[PDB]
């Protein structure tokens, strides 16, 4: 297991968080739940070297 990060660049929400997952696809599902749970809907981009997601 490894730890991934996300950057949030939404209208009223802006910040970062982490979770732990085995693949990036499972992490993508976890961050998608978080963003939806807080109302954020945007465009997703990924960087594998930093293991960081970011939605805008």
């Amino acid at each position: 297991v490894t730890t991934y990060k996300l950057v949030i660049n939404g209208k009223t929400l802006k910040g970062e968080t982490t979770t732990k997952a085995v693949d990036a696809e499972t992490a993508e599902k976890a961050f998608k739940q978080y963003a939806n749970d807080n109302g954020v809907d945007g465009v997703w981009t990924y960087d594998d070297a930093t293991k960081t997601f970011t939605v805008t």
Binding site: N36, D37, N38, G39
Partner: protein
Amino acid sequence: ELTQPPSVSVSPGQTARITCSGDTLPKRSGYWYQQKPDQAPLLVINKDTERPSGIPERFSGSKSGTTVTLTISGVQAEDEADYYCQSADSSFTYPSFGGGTKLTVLGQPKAAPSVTLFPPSSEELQANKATLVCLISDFYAVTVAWKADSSPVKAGVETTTPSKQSNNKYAASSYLSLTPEQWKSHRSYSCQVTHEGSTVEKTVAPT
């Protein structure tokens, strides 16, 4: 079952009495504990009358059959606490406590609570969740109640114990968790706050 009042209020300098009732009291002995907040309970009265070594002389007890009474002659601000009576149960085998009495002491001017009822946020509702927020602030022990239309709700309720604010006044909060279907299936929702026999209500409805 040991019965004592939920709250007793005083002002500095006078005599304060807390009464604990129970059937098994005469054939047994009662005991009194004081609990400062966030601390372990402290025994303050032994064998229905005896004062332990270390408690101020102003702490006396009395017994009148099925009644024990803790008396504080000349109360001070260092005694605002919670007080628990204790005895044996109906079977004389296990120790039993009472409900507990929140003894308030300081007499800064009595404050009427201010209440604000908040609707569920739009962001929360798109996540298939509903949570009503009742906020009580600037009062000087409080009870809270929820009503759907004209019926009491006793499910999905969370209450927080009062906490002192920056301005020395107390404040408390309550939450009502619902599915969004229950939020739209009722005409309104009401928060009912009872403070020293004075009750203030707030109401919300879906937009």
